[PDB]
Amino acid sequence: GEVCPGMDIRNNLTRLHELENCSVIEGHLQILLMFKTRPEDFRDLSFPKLIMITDYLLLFRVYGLESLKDLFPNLTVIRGSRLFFNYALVIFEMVHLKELGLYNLMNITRGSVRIEKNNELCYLATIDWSRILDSVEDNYIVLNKDNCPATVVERCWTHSHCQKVCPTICKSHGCTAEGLCCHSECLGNCSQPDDPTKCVACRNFYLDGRCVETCPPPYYHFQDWRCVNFSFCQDLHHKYVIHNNKCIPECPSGYTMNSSNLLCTPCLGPCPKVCHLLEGEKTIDSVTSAQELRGCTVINGSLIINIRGAELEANLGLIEEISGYLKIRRSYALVSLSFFRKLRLIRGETLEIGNYSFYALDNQNLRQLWDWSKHNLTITQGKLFFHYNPKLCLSEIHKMEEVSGTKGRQERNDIAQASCENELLKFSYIRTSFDKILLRWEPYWPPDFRDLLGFMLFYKEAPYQNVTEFDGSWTVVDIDPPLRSNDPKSQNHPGWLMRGLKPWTQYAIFVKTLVTFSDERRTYGAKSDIIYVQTDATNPSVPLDPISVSNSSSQIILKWKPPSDPNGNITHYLVFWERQAEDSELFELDYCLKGLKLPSREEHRPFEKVVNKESLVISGLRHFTGYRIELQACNQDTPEERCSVAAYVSARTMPEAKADDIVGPVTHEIFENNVVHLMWQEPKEPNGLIVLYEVSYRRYGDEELHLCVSRKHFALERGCRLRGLSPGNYSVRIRATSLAGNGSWTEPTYFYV
């Protein structure tokens, strides 16, 4: 067989002859408007070589077609990878079609058939689309004329040829033209049974006449249809890309390729994307336009900003160079033009009338243009215009002139409320408590000292030295002038402090003067520098999430998480654990009450300066022994340590099921009056403590019986004193029962009673 691309034929049946040397249509067939055609044309014109399509058939107004079977006798699979409006097949409006007739179609991997408005079109209810198609939700079929398996009714394309339905055991894997199940990797039909190298379709991926699950390199995928060597994709691209072993058309987002390295390596996040706006131009007045141009890492064409008034910087700040000019006009709420993080060089290739590479008008809100301390913005050429916008002072425009390299391209006719603080205000004193900070600065007086209307002070948390003065947010309060204070010294140094500030957090602080807006020449005033002050460190918050799990009998692991409010670098966690004696009620009362009524109730605590270990492994404890734990957290080590108040947990070690029995046998003595006295010693390292011991005493011929001997019973009777004993050899087994549970029975103690 031979492969071909996909083409559509229109009113010229001559073109149809090109498929004689074809086997697969790497695309979609199409026929429509065959008015010139007559039944004498297609009654026998055939192209049996065709064996499988990939996107979709179609027909329309095909005058002359008697039976479609005469065309595609061997057509077997319509992959429907690309659908004509979710329709794999589409027949439409041919009056000469007596029957579809195609007796080899065997799967429609996608979509759904569609047949309509056809006269003489018979054999419709006899086609079991459920068997062939894979989803039959819409086999839209209306306005029509309407041996082998029957499903109440026999199914057949034609009375001479039925549907080629075979036993279900063949599954979608398909079955021979004679009806024999094929290899799993095959689809529809196989020339030989169970032979992946002898079937026409391929469920996963065709390869060199063999049904396989992937292609081998240098032969990668190809539109999830076949396998082609690398050179094929390279030639196609020369006139395609390589990625994930898949020679897909174009690589996905966040990727790009090199001419030599066809494989598209990941880009740096923002991948180069030149955007040619409508006619290389555009206007921005709403966030909608910015979103429509979101992520244009590069631009080619002038851009005009005329906007009302974070989102913009999300949709902007993506370009290093703009081919055309940039313009801002009438956008009267532009606090500053720093929405252009990347903007580096206005190419000015497209120049505005008058040869201007910039323009600002009716925007008396431009507090600033950029952070020129760092921003290396450049301009290739072009004049500039900033009329009716003297809200920003001419010093900023001069900085424009220097940094942009436009010194010989500007004039005062580019500029026209002015509030450039011509003086500087120097802080004279600042102290830092753990939550409050003092402020003092030189007592600035304008030459018309009467004018001053009190200073204005601003601050905000600044975990990193970014500071966006003139952007907005932040800003808090203002102050009034102290008093004239007359003359030399003793000016009173106007100041202010703040109260509610979190400890150990860098704070950015600066004070500007709010002077009366004198219409005549105004001594704009002093704008203090921007300073960073970090308050002190107080004692932290209590350590949090302390859980004293037990991993071993005599070992405890304590897991805790960093305190919710560190309020200071946590130098080291201080952990104190102490062993606690059991409750007095758990050591004094009696505990042998039948129907157990067991009560259900310098101090160098051994400590370690755990460092960075949020979960401690305590060692040296005693199994199931009372322990009072504590978690001291501090953020200061060498001087007086600000160790916050500790949390608490009374962890109990997991018990040992070896050190809870009666160590050794049970001492005893016998009396001639059928009385036996018992004695023993409890372990010195029990599971916390042993309150009661289970006794079990037996006589030969009789059966074992149990008696309870508590600590009080032990002391009163020096252990136990059995009474009511029958003559004969005896046997006694005793098991200690600590709080954890019953231990181990003692060795059978034998005597005569």
Partner: protein, 130 residues
């Protein structure tokens, strides 16, 4: 002195309130740096004023500042009267008379702010005589 008992009173208030605690901290941090406690006293009264919260006990203590300025205004008045009777220029004499009348009226209304604003002018005028 009076400042010491004022510190003690603000300390007692601090034991019950946070504002007084901050006030005492300011006093201490200014003391330790060698600065006049009275300058910080006027500044801290100004800060209380700008805060605008009622906080009646603290402002009532700061009324000591009103007492101090009221006493100072007497010295300012006396200087101005001496200058007025011994001023070298008639216009200076008329300005001194106006200032004296302003001082008396400001005290009449019991307004401390005007008293401050006028004692400043009083010192300015007294500069000329000496």
């Amino acid at each position: 002195s009076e400042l010491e008992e004022i510190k003690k009173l603000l300390e007692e208030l601090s034991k019950t309130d946070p504002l007084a605690k901050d006030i005492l901290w300011v006093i201490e941090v200014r003391e330790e740096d060698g600065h006049d406690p009275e300058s910080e006293l006027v500044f801290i009264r100004q800060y209380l004023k700008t805060l605008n919260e009622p906080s009646p006990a603290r402002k009532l203590i700061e009324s000591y500042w009103a007492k101090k300025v009221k006493k100072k205004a007497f010295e300012a008045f006396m200087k101005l009267m001496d200058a007025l009777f011994l001023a070298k220029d008639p216009e200076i004499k008329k300005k001194a008379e106006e200032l004296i009348k302003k001082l008396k009226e400001a005290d009449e209304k019991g307004d401390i702010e005007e008293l401050e604003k006028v004692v400043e002018e009083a010192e300015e005028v007294y500069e000329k005589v000496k």
